[PDB]
Design a protein around this ligand. Structure first.
Ligand SMILES: [Zn+2]
Ligand SMILES: [Zn+2]
Lengths: 88, 60, 237, 50
RNA sequence: CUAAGCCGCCCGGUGGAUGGCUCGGCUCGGGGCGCCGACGAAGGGCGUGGCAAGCUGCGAUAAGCCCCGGCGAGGCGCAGGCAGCCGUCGAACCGGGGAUUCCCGAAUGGGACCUCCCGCGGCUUAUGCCGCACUCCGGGGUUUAUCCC
RNA sequence: CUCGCGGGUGAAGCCGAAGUCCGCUGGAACGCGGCGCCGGAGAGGGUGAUAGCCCCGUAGGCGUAAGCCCGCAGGGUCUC
RNA sequence: ACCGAUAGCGAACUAGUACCGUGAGGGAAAGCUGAAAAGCACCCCGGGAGGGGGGUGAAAAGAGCCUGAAACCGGGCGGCG
RNA sequence: ACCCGAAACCGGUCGAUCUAGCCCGGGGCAGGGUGAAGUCCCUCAACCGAGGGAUGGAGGCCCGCUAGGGGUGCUGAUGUGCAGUUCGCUCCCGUGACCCCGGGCUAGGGGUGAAAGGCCAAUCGAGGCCGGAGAUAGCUGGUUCCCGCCGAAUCAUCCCG
RNA sequence: GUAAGGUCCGGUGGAGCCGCCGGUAUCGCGGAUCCUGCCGGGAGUAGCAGCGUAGUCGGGUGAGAAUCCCGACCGCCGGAGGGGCCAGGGUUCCACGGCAAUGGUCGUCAGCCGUGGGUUAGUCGGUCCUAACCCCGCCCGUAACUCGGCGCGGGGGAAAGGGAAACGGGUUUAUAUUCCCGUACCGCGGGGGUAGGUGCGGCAACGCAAGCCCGGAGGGUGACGCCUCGGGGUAGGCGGACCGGCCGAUGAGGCCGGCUAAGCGUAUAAGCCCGGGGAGUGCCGUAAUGGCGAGAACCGGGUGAAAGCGCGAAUGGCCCCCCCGUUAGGGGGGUUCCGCCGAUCCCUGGGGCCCGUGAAAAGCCCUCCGGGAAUUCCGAUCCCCCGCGACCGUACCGAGAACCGACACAGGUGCCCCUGGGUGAGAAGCCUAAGGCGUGUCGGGGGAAACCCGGCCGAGGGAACUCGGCAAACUGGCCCCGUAACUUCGGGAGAAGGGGUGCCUGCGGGUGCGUAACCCGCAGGUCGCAGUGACUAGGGGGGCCCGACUGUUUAAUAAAAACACAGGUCCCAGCUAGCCCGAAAGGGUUUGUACUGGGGCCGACGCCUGCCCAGUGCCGGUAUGUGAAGCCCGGGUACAACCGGGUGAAGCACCGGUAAACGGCGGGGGUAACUAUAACCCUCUUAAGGUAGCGAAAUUCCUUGUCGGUUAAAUGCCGACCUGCAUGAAUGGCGUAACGAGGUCCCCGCUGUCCCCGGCCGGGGCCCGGCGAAACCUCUGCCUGGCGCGCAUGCCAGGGACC
RNA sequence: GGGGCCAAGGGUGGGGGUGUUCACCCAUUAAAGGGGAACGUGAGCUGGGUUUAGACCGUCGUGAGACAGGUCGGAUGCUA
RNA sequence: AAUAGGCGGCCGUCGAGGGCUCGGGUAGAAGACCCGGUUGAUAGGGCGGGGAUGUAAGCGGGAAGGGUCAACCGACCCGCUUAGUCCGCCGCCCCUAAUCGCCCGAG
């Protein structure tokens, strides 16, 4: 196989085509899930994928519909309560 | 070792390639300068009075 | 003859150069113009292991928006608040001018002159004792046991450097030593001059023994200062 | 070898075109005086200068 | 009428000496001429012939294109061939002056692990042209930027 | 300085005398013997051999755009 | 009053050419038909290369081409054997 | 200075595709064994405590013709060789101080060196290329046609002789 | 002609050449292990074997066939000799026409020769980003530069790092993700409609089409080490049924085919999270570690991968049958399930380790800040449609003949990525399927020897061989029992030693829905010399020296006791330091700061490391002596040169510390008591006179020291003695478990090492047909005794001898 | 048994330590003789000793180093 | 054996005696030597003898057990069976091939 595909950054799958031939399919590994800014906890509502897959989706299908989507719900409530208490 | 077996490891990148200035295969590609005319390192040509190749070129 | 390792180190070849790109950056204080006549509070964001530092480091985000790297003192807490300035409380992690530190306190990261950035007592598990406070100088006892005088406006941090006690555990393995010294690109393994060749070392020769006394004069030229340099005494006292 | 810069490819092409026999009509014109030229090459034995 | 072998003569093979030849060298009193380049040099890369590989000469107008003058019937290089063409509206050739003159190269708007690529503004309908390196000199503008003309 | 003129020099280059007369050898005369001619030209080369007179050329002369040099004439500047 | 193709410049010629070394750099060998190609038309043999006749040329000088020494090899001849 | 031959010395430049060291980015090592820390469980006695079984996967650990790496003995084959360092059997390491690849840096009295004067392009007690250079030597070798006339010496003094 | 030579006669040749006089010169050849060219004997000889011993029979082609082509049979690799693809090579690629040369033989053949042709991209790679690092401009240094350099500004730097997008069928002699057909995707721009600007459902996690343009900030992803384990999935494989074909007896049975890409739509698993809930004489849970009032059991619910499923898609690919068959074609069927094993290939989570912390940037997504228009209007990340996507590489080998090593080189580069069935733990060994090959390329003959190299066996004895058990042999896998001295308590250890092992007929146990699959036992019968029957596959034990161990070393005669190592200890240095490069500028240690940087010696671990500072060295002081220039004073000079004196730093003299600094640690006077012994013991030359340990030693001359053990026999080995020529405490002393291709001695066993050698197998050797050299070579080549430069094939006197 | 003469046809062996020749020792034997042949015999073998390049110990030297002092390792070309 | 020998026989002044080719080892590296060659048992073949292993394939019966305790499977044992296979040894039988042909040779 080609030296570029000899690297482990590609994932290799042996696929048999309709004509009976055996070919090797290559593709890039998917990125990991997004994490909370503060506690570093996995987030929700943010699908995994490469930039092409992200651009394939609309805006509302990539983040939850609530303020501060970059924080987990616990941190979001923490920040909101702290902010309102400081304001009042 | 040090002989025939070691001579088989010459399949790496060549040390010298063709030079855009003097036309000789003496351009150090890793260091980016010519070992014959000094192209890429000196504005003026690499000439030395103890060297006779530049005179050989013109039969002088 | 040939060159010595100490001579070759002076030419800065990659065999002897520090790999100062694996590290987390330089640890220096905020510019003195910010600290003087004004106290700032910063929040500790993370604590990290610097490959070559001998001590752990920490990131601090200051009220003014500056992110800095500091040597974390023992007991520092992530998310903790620290103060730098003249009006900061006496506590671990705070940086004060030397004239405002009560005598008998342990400090670290002492500036040689006001505003340089800190030069003294930065290794893990070290501290210095503030002995006296005078209008012209502040006396501090350093880890080596020397009482040094500092300008009263020099900045220092209270506490002790984390990571002390390393030497308690033996390295055991030549491989452990290999990784330890490779992390810093320090010359290892090391040869012996007595078993070197005469061309290479003053002590070299077929008979493995120095042919001359090993205490070398301080006036010896480069390439001759090996062994005990300007030794007042030798042996076991 | 698989990936070649254009200039190197052109130089190889020039050498390939250079390597060929002397025309028979040229031999006849010179009256068997010109038979061969110095630039003949065998790929396995005589390598290119580059 | 001795088989192999040895020496000598003749003829033959192998080889390339000797002899003769010379459009090449070497040396020299005297005589002539002595710099080329941003109006882009010298060295080099690649192309260019109907049949064309090397050398030589030329540059996409590519063993050549144009004008004045000299020579006067042949010409298409080294290079003895086939075919064909150019020339008396004066060719070939020679001296003078012009046109074209790819790419790299001081190489210069920015880059070179390949003498190949990527750029920014005016003109132009568009084709396609003209400007933009660094270190300075004499000026102008203002934004005072050594930024622009 | 040349709106102007004259001269010199100055690229290719042009002119430049005298046997292809008989006999012999020869594949082929530049050779041998005989009979001639020019010559300020008998330096040298080619030509089917070794050639003053077969050809180039030499001895000696001629022409030449641009450029350069000198001069005439007119118009100016400057110095003692 | 230089050399005459192992000489003379390294190069009398497709010579700083071919070739050697990563590199700086090093660097050869190689001239001659005849006056004119008139460069062998035709015949027999051979798979071919070429051989034998026959032609050209004053002379094959036959292109593997001016002369063709020596070393070396094959045959005949004379002597020994 | 009749001709040839030195080991060597000096100047300026060229080399880290071999090999030595370090930096950046990557690829790889079948199968089995042993069983460290940690975490526990069961039977009886209970003032103490005895008996039995599990789990767990650490190691510059072990065997191993996996791949890969090395080169101990045969002082085997070969030794105008397949080869200017090779081949066979035997042997050693094989999760680590491991093996390899691409992009980089360190250049000659200098580099690099787990230190053998080892390695730095088949060259290393100071590399290669060209120049000084036709270096020098009391040391070795060579010095080309004929005839004719006379014809030696290796012993005294002085020289780092 | 004494000659160096000259001149004549006879041939070849076709164009120049000579006598005499006087000048000039690269002016005379056997040597220089001389230079250039050519040619000899060696020689029709060596080699064309050893690491993979491969061909044979018919037919064809062609002038010519061991070597070229087709069929069959026999073989070899089969974890690569197969498949794919770098660097390097550069046309070696394909067809046709050929054999002058090349090919280790031949050649009709070819990687050879001649003639024509061959590389098609928006999606693959470069191009983009940045890493180690490099370059240019300013600046400083240099006599100067093309030289050296810190700091700023700019640019480069990966064809295996990051990084937008495509798959399947067919097509050519040679190109395919590139060409044709089918079906898709990304970037930019454009034309409609719509969501939104101005909208909703959930307590919640969240579900949603959820405004447009410009600038900025934040967060995420990009984005990462080593070891180990669980869970989900897919390639691949196994067994059964059933449609077709082949083989088989048109028996049983065996073998072949039964296939399915991107792209679209679609869900859960683990993790995490949300709402209800309110526990402990605890509860729940994992393979394991574990979780809980800081919120557990238990209920519902959200977000979340690899995959599977549906379209793509059966007209496609595959297998089969039939009509036509001079030639060229045309049609009709199957292409369906079940049950297992299962990856090193993917996805996802636990856990453990670091004195080791295992990249950056472009890019992409979201949110938030301000700014700009939008109302008969603005307008998408949503649906439909149209236009444009440049430049360069793309053939082929990829190696036992397409690369490097001069080669069609048994080396190196590339083991760089992958491996069906059986036995088996196994990617081992052996056999075999697919795929490849008969080109690790000269063939033929043969009791056709001797001898050499590889292999097998060998009676009786068993190391008697040899420097030495070199080489070979013995053991060998798995299960059970059973295991010593010593010890750092972990080891030694698979110590040692003993028993069993096949096949067949059944039972029982583990996990399991299963009589599926993989393992674990029991009883009986039975065969052989031999049951790990081939293959694979440790021999063992007891002493001594050295080094603690793993590891490194003289590429090409030394792999070791040498080097390194963790540990010990000593020295310099508080930063503009200590040490170091340089001509300087500046720089390395330094993105450092005494638990640190730099410099020596010893060298795990256990017990310890004694005396000496006179000598050399280093450090501190330096009152005092000496001590250069400069300065001052007097003389001298119409001014100087010059002479005398004063001041006088560093350095030496002088004083003190310093031995895990270099190094040393004798001698006598003596010694008495018992005879030797002299042991305690007292004193002087110079600093002190070797302490604890060890001793004929890797150190011992005499030396094979003496005594004891080992043997029948002992220049050996082990223990001891001390007379230590010439041991000794960090150039360390002593001891030491484990470890060792280190040196060394002994015991059992084993054996052709030997007594004493003998058979057999394959490859050479030998003959025949081909291609075909080299090292070397004064000419030659019989002996005895002599002469001689003292050891003659060649000389002297004899002897012998056909080629 | 001791001494001596003629006589060279044949034999004169096997083992232990040591690189050993030699010498010593063991059991047999009639005996277990001394020498020459380039200290016969490496284009026949082996490579243990000796005599390079690595390394350790003792002694000497300030040192680089040295030791006819020990000790471990260290290549043997052939087509007559 | 350089005094390079003796004797018997055959041939010569076309021709005695040989060589290659042919079937084989009492032999052997090539050469050479030895037997046989239709005047024949040299080799092959057929038959027989004598040997070396150790009782073939096939069939019938049994078999520890299983199975519906049936059919059927079963390592292995027994009889046909001193079997079968092979023979680089021997005897008899011209059935096949030792044939055709070429060459040297004293005068
Ligand atoms: Zn959070
Ligand atoms: Zn150049």
């Amino acid at each position: 196989m080609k030296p570029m595909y000899r690297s482990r950054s590609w994932r290799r799958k042996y696929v048999r085509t309709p004509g009976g031939r055996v070919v090797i399919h290559f593709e890039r590994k998917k990125p990991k899930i997004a994490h909370c800014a503060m506690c570093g906890r996995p987030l929700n509502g943010i699908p995994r994928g490469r930039p092409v897959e992200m651009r394939k989706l609309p805006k509302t299908k990539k983040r939850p519909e609530r303020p501060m989507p970059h924080l987990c719900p616990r941190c979001m409530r923490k920040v909101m309560k702290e902010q309102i208490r400081a304001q009042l | 070792g040090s002989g025939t077996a070691t001579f088989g490891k010459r399949n790496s990148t060549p040390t010298h390639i063709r030079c855009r200035r003097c036309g000789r295969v003496s351009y150090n590609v890793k260091k980016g300068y010519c070992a014959a005319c000094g192209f890429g390192r000196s504005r003026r040509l690499r000439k030395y009075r103890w060297s006779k190749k530049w005179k050989k070129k013109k039969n002088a | 003859g040939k060159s010595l390792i100490q001579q070759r180190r002076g030419k800065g070849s990659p065999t002897f150069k520090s790999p100062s790109h694996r590290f987390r950056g330089a640890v220096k204080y905020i510019p003195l113009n910010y600290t003087q006549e004004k106290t700032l509070r910063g929040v500790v964001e993370e604590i990290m292991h610097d490959p070559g530092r001998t001590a752990p480091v920490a990131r601090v985000k200051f009220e003014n928006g500056i992110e800095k790297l500091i040597i974390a003192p023992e007991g520092l807490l992530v998310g903790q608040e620290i103060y730098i300035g003249p009006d900061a409380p006496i506590a671990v992690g705070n940086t004060l001018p030397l004239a405002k530190i009560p005598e008998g306190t342990y400090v670290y990261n002492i500036e040689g002159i006001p505003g340089d950035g800190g030069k003294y007592v930065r290794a893990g598990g070290t501290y210095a004792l503030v002995v006296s406070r005078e209008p012209d100088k502040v006396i501090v006892q350093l880890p080596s046991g020397e009482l040094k005088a500092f300008n009263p406006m020099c900045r220092a941090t209270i506490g002790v450097v984390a990571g002390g006690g390393r030497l308690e555990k033996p390295l055991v393995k030549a491989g452990k030593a290999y990784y330890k010294y490779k992390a810093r690109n320090k010359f290892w393994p090391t040869p012996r001059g007595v078993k070197m060749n005469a061309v290479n070392h003053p002590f070299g020769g077929k008979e493995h023994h120095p042919g001359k006394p090993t205490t070398t004069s301080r006036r010896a030229p480069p390439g001759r200062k090996v062994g005990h340099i300007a030794a007042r005494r030798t042996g076991r006292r | 070898a698989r990936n070649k810069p254009l200039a190197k490819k052109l130089r190889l092409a020039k050498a390939l075109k250079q390597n060929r026999r002397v025309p028979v009509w040229v031999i006849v014109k010179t009256n068997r005086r010109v038979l061969t030229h110095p630039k003949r090459r065998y790929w396995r034995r005589t390598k290119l200068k580059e």
